[PDB]
Amino acid sequence: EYDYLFKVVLIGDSGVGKSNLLSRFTRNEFNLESGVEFATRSIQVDGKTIKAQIWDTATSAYYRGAVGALLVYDIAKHLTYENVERWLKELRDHADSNIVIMLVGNKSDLRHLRAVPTDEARAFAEKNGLSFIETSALDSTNVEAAFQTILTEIY
Template sequence: MSNFIDYNQKIDYVFKIVLIGDSAVGKSQFLARFARNEFNTDSKATIGVEFQTKTLSMDNKTVKAQIWDTAGQERYRAVTSAYYRGAVGAMLVYDMTKRQSFDHMARWLEELRGHADKNIIIMLIGNKCDLGSLRAVPTEDAEEFAQRENLFFMETSALEATNVETAFWTVLAEIYRIISKKTLAGNDDSDGNPGVFKGTRILVPSQPQNSEKKGCCM
């Protein structure tokens, strides 16, 4: 796979990805790092819902990732049904320096599974791994939770651009492989609509080569 884009190409697929988790775990910065390779130290809390897009190339197909970010505060939780509708991937984000944000993952996962497609691809993200000396969530705890719930797992740092691109690529490539596999099998129910998602979980695809910093836990 390559991330080179010819912007004259038509869009073959649109994949909606949602970011969920408590407030102040770094969801917006995580998204900004992937979508625009930016990090804003003066970032304000997200109000309501925002989304960004990024266009990628996978096996000569043009894929637009539409990534939705919402406020983690309780008073914005009423957006759920519209927020999750049509999502084919999700990032469950916690702050590895805040144990409570990890303990809330079970609740967020329950909400996600209550509103989203049952086959949605989900990755657990332990963000802010650049703050290793302040770690409050052992990697083993997150790995155990991810394994029990059948989630992918990665620790990231939006600040240092560690594993951010790899995390998104893993989720997007997994979605793409499932959809393309269905198409090749002659069992594509999308009727020409990009981004329709049907399928079952398969193994993690090989990750793309890029210049992103590696570290933390993968």
């Protein structure tokens, strides 16, 4: 048996590798080459077994049963971080008010192409009081940690 079944969403502009974050976290695979899809892997949290159901898209049925929101913005594309406000609105309108939002700065391996400040984007997290973390599906840096915290912080 698994104790609880969580459902967290992956939203954001297309091209930020949220489908790759999905792959790396569950299947542990990343592909440089490029409908709606979800996949699940179970992790032990607080002595409990949880089947975290990560959803992914390319509308309200999406946010139905949504437990935690994963806002993924690309650090090499400033416009993606710009649309976070437009993505909160989409959350504000359709998402459950209770859902825990964690801001994700993906593609952190692109150090020399950084367009989004690591400190600043972490500041927007405090103004909205949401947890923040920068990740990378290509080297799996802070990948398991992102869901490890979102799934842990979901209680």
